[PDB]
C-alpha cells in the first residue's frame with residue numbers, strides 16, 4: 019500500500035562553495051542622506067547594536083582559500099571606500115587671505 | 117516583497133473547484149477594480165462656451181489649489197509689442213485660461229472614477245467593510261437587470277426627477293478643488309466677480325477691505341524698451357495685480373466684510389443626463405461571458421483616451 | 437573553479453567545488469529605494485532591511501536581496517522552476533563579523549557569508565510511502581507472520597509509468613535531499629523481476645490488527661473470522677451502515693467526489709513456503725529468512741533439513757515429540773496422525 | 783520545463799463540507815475534510831490602521847506587515 | 849495581475865490544515881527501563897520487562 023509524499027526530492031550532482039565579504043561604512047551613508055551631527059550619532063548607535071548582536075553568538079571558522087589582503091578587488095574597493103574624494107593641494111609658496 | 121516570495125515557492129494542485137466559478141470571487145474582483153467608476157451621457161454634444169473663467173471664490177498663490185494649473189500670472193517683464201489677445205485670446209490676465217483639450221466639440225460622454233460626489237450616505241468616518249455594503253445595496257436598489265442608474269439617483273441639476281439618492285450637488289467652491297469635473301459636468305456657467313465694470317457696476321454705484329472692487333480698470337495695455345525690442349521690456353497691465361492681497365475674493369465669498377459681488381448665469385447643457393455603473397456591468401456581463409473576458413474588455417474601456425482613468429489622482433480623474 | 441558556469445562540466449563528480457574569488461558587495465549600491473528617500477524615512481527603511489537580514493541568518497537561510505537573480509540564472513543555465521527549488525534548499529554560514537570604524541557620528545562593518553548551493557540531478561514530485569502488511573500462515577500447529585523484503589522505499593508516478601526508488605544518505609532542508617537514488621524492479625519469480633528474501637516470525641494466537649484508513653475504509657489482518665471477513669489473508673473493508681466488528685465500530689464513510697487517481701497497481705505474485713515453516717520460525721525465537729521470491733523447490737528444501745532432522749526422539753519428552761509428529765503429518769496422512777495422536781495420549 | 787506537484791491531490795477522491803461547523807459531526811471518521819468554497823480577502827479591507835495614516839507613514843506601516 | 853510604473857496588483861493562494869484535538873495531555877513522564885541482574889548456573893544475565 020502507499021501514502022502521498024508532498025515534499026520534492028532533489029538528487030545531488032555536486033556542491034559549489036563561495037566566499038562573500040560585506041563591507042559597511044556609516045560615513046558614506048551619512049554623506050548621501052545629508053545627515054546632521056545629531057543624527058550621525060543615531061546612525062552609529064543603530065548600526066553597532068545590530069552588528070554586535072550578530073558578533074556575540076558566532077565563533078570563527080577557517081576557510082581554505084587565500085587571504086583577501088592579497089586580492090586586487092579587495093585592495094581597490096577598500097582604498098575607494100576610505101579615500102575616493104580626498105585630495106591634497108600645494109600653493110606655489112605660502113600666502114594667506116589678506 | 118511579493119517577488120521574493122514568488123521566487124522560492126513551486127505550484128501545487130488543490131482538489132477544489134476553480135475560483136473563477138464562485139460568486140464571492142466575481143463580486144470582490146469587480147468591486148476592487150470598478151467600485152466608483154461611472155459613465156455619463158449628454159442629451160447631445162455641447163462644450164463649455166468661453167476660454168476665460170472669472171472665479172474669485174478661489175484663493176490665489178502668494179494649501180496648494182488644483183485650479184492654479186489654469187491661472188494666468190501677470191508678469192512685469194515682457195517682449196516688445198506683447199498683447200494677451202496674441203496668446204490667451206479673450207481671457208483677463210490674472211484670471212484662468214481653459215485649454216482647447218477641455219472644450220472639444222464632438223465629446224458626447226464623460227467617464228470618471230472617484231468617490232468625491234457621493235451624497236451624505238457616504239462617510240470616510242465609517243468602516244471600509246460598511247461603506248462597501250452600503251454602496252453594494254444602493255447600486256442593487258437603484259438598478260433593474262441592466263447597468264443604467266434610475267433617475268432618482270442623480271442630483272436635481274442633471275435631471276428633473278433626481279433626488280440625490282447616490283450623488284450630491286456640485287457647489288461654488290468645487291471649481292477650486294476639482295476643475296475638470298465642473299467644466300465637463302456643470303449644466304450652466306455661473307460667474308463670481310469683484311471686477312469693476314461687470315453688470316454695469318460703476319465705482320460711484322454702491323448703494324480693511326470694506327466696500328471696494330478687487331481689480332479696477334487702467335487706461336490701456338502698453339510696453340516700453342530702451343533700444344532692445346526683443347527680450348526684456350517693462351509691461352503696463354489693463355487691470356491691477358492681486359499678489360499683495362490674494363485672499364480678497366475667498367474672504368469676500370465667506371462674508372467677513374460686505375462687497376459688490378456680481379453673479380450671472382449662462383446655460384450650456386440640457387438637464388436630461390443618463391448615467392451607467394461599470395461595477396454593476398462587470399457583475400452582470402461576467403454571468404454570461406465569464407470574468408477573465410469582461411475584466412480585460414472593461415479595463416481597455418478605462419484607457420479609451422490613452423491614459424487609464426483609474427490610475428489618475430482621485431480629485432482629477434474626469435475625461436471626455 | 438574559475439567561473440560559476442564551470443559547475444555544469446559533464447566529467448566532474450559528486451563533491452564540493454568552491455568558486456576561486458570572493459564576491460564583493462556594498463549595501464549603499466544594492467539598496468536603491470533608500471537613495472531617493474530623505475531624513476528619518478531613509479533611516480527607518482534601512483532598519484527594516486537590517487532586521488530582516490539578521491532574522492534569515494539565525495535560521496541558516498540566504499537573503500537573496502544582495503545577489504542578482506538574472507546573473508545567477510544566466511551563470512547556472514537553469515529553468516525558472518529549477519531556480520525556485522535551488523533557492524529554497526540553499527543554506528548560509530556567517531564566518532566573520534568585524535567593525536572597521538567607530539566614531540560618535542559614523543560606523544562601518546564587514547560580514548563574511550559562506551553559501552552552499554545543492555545542484556539537482558532529478559526532482560520527483562508525485563510520491564508514495566511503502567507500508568508492508570504481510571500474511572498469516574498456520575503451520576504444524578504454530579501461527580506465523582510472513583513478510584517480503586522489498587528493494588524500494590518510495591513509489592513514484594508522474595504521468596502513466598510507475599517507478600520504484602531505493603534512497604540512500606538522505607537529509608531534510610525543507611524538501612528531502614538524497615546523495616544516492618537507485619531505480620529498481622518489484623519482486624517476482626522471473627528473469628525480469630527482483631529475487632527478494634522472505635521473512636517468517638512466530639506470533640501469539642489470537643492475532644487481530646485493524647487500521648482505520650483516512651478515506652473511511654479499514655485495513656484488517658486477523659487469525660479469526662468476524663462480519664464475513666476471511667481469516668489469514670489481509671483486506672481493505674468498507675460498510676454501508678455502522679456496525680461492531682472485532683470489538684470496535686466500523687462506520688459508514690461520507691460520500692466523496694471522484695478526481696483523477698495516481699494510485700500504484702503492483703504485479704501479483706504466487707509464493708511457495710516450506711511445509712514446516714511454523715516449526716522453523718518457533719525454534720529460532722526471532723524473525724528469520726525462509727526463502728526468496730524466485731527460489732527452486734530443491735534449494736528451498738535443502739535449507740532447514742539438517743536442522744529439522746536433528747530434532748530427533750528423546751527419552752525425556754517422547755509424548756511431547758509424538759504430538760509434534762502428528763501435527764506435522766495431519767495434512768499429508770490423516771489416518772497416521774489419528775494413530776500417532778492416540779499413542780501420544782496413552 | 784514547468785513543475786507542479788500533485789502531493790495534496792494523489793488519491794483521486796475528496797470529502798468536502800458546506801460549512802466549517804460540519805467538522806464537529808459525531809459520525810465522521812479520522813481523515814481530511816475540505817471546506818467546499820474559497821475564502822476571498824482584500825488586504826485594504828483587513829488593514830484598518832493604514833486607512834487613517836498619510837504619506838510615507840502609511841507606506842512604511844504596510845512594508846512592516848508584508 | 850497588473851504592472852504599471854505607478855500601480856501593481858498580486859494574488860496569493862494559501863492552503864491551511866487545522867488539526868482538531870480529541871484530548872490534550874499536559875503532566876507527562878518518559879519511561880526508562882532499568883531491569884535486574886540474575887546469576888544462574890555460573891552465567892550473569894540481565895532481565896527486563
Ligand SMILES: *[C@@H]1O[C@H](CO)[C@@H](O[C@@H]2O[C@H](CO)[C@@H](O[C@@H]3O[C@H](CO[C@H]4O[C@H](CO)[C@@H](O)[C@H](O)[C@@H]4O)[C@@H](O)[C@H](O[C@H]4O[C@H](CO)[C@@H](O)[C@H](O)[C@@H]4O[C@@H]4O[C@H](CO)[C@@H](O)[C@H](O)[C@H]4NC(C)=O)[C@@H]3O)[C@H](O)[C@H]2NC(C)=O)[C@H](O)[C@H]1NC(C)=O
Nearest residue numbers: 273285286287288291298302304305306315377378379381
Ligand atoms: C456649477 O453648478 C453649481 C450648481 O450645482 C453652481 O453652484 C451654485 O452657484 C450659484 C451662483 O453662485 C448659487 O446661487 C446663488 O446663491 C446666492 C446665495 O443664496 C442665498 O441667498 C438667497 C437669496 O438671495 C436665498 O434664496 C438662498 O437660500 C441663500 O440663502 C444668491 O445670492 C444668488 O442669487 C443672486 O444671483 C442670481 C443669479 O442668477 C439671481 O437670479 C438672484 O436674483 C440673486 O440676485 C443677483 O445678485 C448678484 C450679486 O449677488 C447680482 O450680480 C445680480 O445682478 C443679482 N440679480 C438680480 C436679478 O437682481 C444665487 O441664487 C447656488 O447656491 C450654487 N448652488 C449650490 C448647490 O451650491 C456653481 O456655481 C457652478 N460653477 C461654475 C463654475 O459654473
Ligand SMILES: *[C@@H]1O[C@H](CO)[C@@H](O[C@@H]2O[C@H](CO)[C@@H](O[C@@H]3O[C@H](CO[C@H]4O[C@H](CO)[C@@H](O)[C@H](O[C@H]5O[C@H](CO)[C@@H](O)[C@H](O)[C@@H]5O)[C@@H]4O)[C@@H](O)[C@H](O[C@H]4O[C@H](CO)[C@@H](O)[C@H](O)[C@@H]4O)[C@@H]3O)[C@H](O)[C@H]2NC(C)=O)[C@H](O)[C@H]1NC(C)=O
Nearest residue numbers: 625626706707708709727728729730731732733734735736
Ligand atoms: C518459482 O518458480 C519455480 C518454477 O515454476 C517453482 O519451482 C517449480 O515448482 C513446480 C511446482 O511445485 C515444480 O513442478 C513439478 O515439476 C515436476 C517435474 O520436474 C522436472 O522437470 C522439469 C521440466 O521443466 C524441470 O524443471 C525439473 O528440474 C528441477 O528439478 C531437478 C530434480 O530435483 C533439479 O535437478 C533441477 O535443478 C531443477 O530444480 C525436473 O527435472 C513434475 O513431476 C511435477 O508434477 C506434479 O504436479 C503436476 C501438476 O500439479 C501433476 O500433474 C503431476 O501429477 C505431479 O503431481 C510438477 O509439475 C517444478 O519442478 C519446480 N521447478 C524447479 C526448477 O524447481 C518455484 O516453486 C517458485 N518459487 C517460489 C518461491 O515460489
Ligand SMILES: *[C@@H]1O[C@H](CO)[C@@H](O[C@@H]2O[C@H](CO)[C@@H](O[C@@H]3O[C@H](CO)[C@@H](O)[C@H](O)[C@@H]3O)[C@H](O)[C@H]2NC(C)=O)[C@H](O)[C@H]1NC(C)=O
Nearest residue numbers: 047048049050051052053469470471472473474475476478
Ligand atoms: C542632499 O542635499 C543636496 C543639496 O541640496 C541635494 O541636491 C540638490 O537636489 C535638488 C533636487 O534634485 C536639485 O535641485 C534641482 O536641480 C536641477 C538641476 O540643476 C534643476 O533642474 C531643478 O530646477 C532644481 O533646481 C539641486 O540641484 C541639488 N543641489 C544643488 C546644490 O544644486 C540632494 O538631493 C539631497 N539628497 C537627498 C534628498 O537624498
Ligand SMILES: *[C@@H]1O[C@H](CO)[C@@H](O[C@@H]2O[C@H](CO)[C@@H](O[C@@H]3O[C@H](CO)[C@@H](O)[C@H](O)[C@@H]3O)[C@H](O)[C@H]2NC(C)=O)[C@H](O)[C@H]1NC(C)=O
Nearest residue numbers: 179232239240241293430431831832833834835836837840
Ligand atoms: C486625505 O485628505 C482628505 C482631504 O483633505 C481628508 O479628508 C478631510 O478630513 C478632515 C479631518 O477629518 C475633515 O475636516 C473636518 O471635517 C469635519 C466634518 O465636516 C468638521 O467637523 C471639522 O471641523 C473639519 O473641517 C474634512 O472634512 C475632510 N475633507 C473634506 C474635503 O471635507 C482625509 O482625512 C485625508 N486622509 C488621511 C489623513 O488619511
Ligand SMILES: *[C@@H]1O[C@H](CO)[C@@H](O[C@@H]2O[C@H](CO)[C@@H](O)[C@H](O)[C@H]2NC(C)=O)[C@H](O)[C@H]1NC(C)=O
Nearest residue numbers: 415416417418419420421422423424427851852
Ligand atoms: C493605453 O493606451 C495607449 C494608447 O493606445 C497605449 O500606448 C502604447 O503602449 C505600448 C506599450 O507597449 C507602446 O508600444 C505603444 O507605442 C503605445 N502607443 C502610444 C501611442 O503611446 C498604452 O499601452 C495603454 N495602456 C494600458 C495600461 O493599457
Ligand SMILES: *[C@@H]1O[C@H](CO)[C@@H](O)[C@H](O)[C@H]1NC(C)=O
Nearest residue numbers: 161216219220221222223224
Ligand atoms: C467632429 O465631428 C464633425 C461632424 O461629424 C466632423 O466634421 C469633424 O471632422 C470632427 N472633428 C473635429 C475636430 O471637428
Ligand SMILES: *[C@@H]1O[C@H](CO)[C@@H](O)[C@H](O)[C@H]1NC(C)=O
Nearest residue numbers: 312313314315316317318380
Ligand atoms: C448694461 O447691462 C445690460 C444687460 O442686459 C447690457 O445689455 C448693456 O450693454 C449694459 N450697458 C453698459 C453701458 O454697460
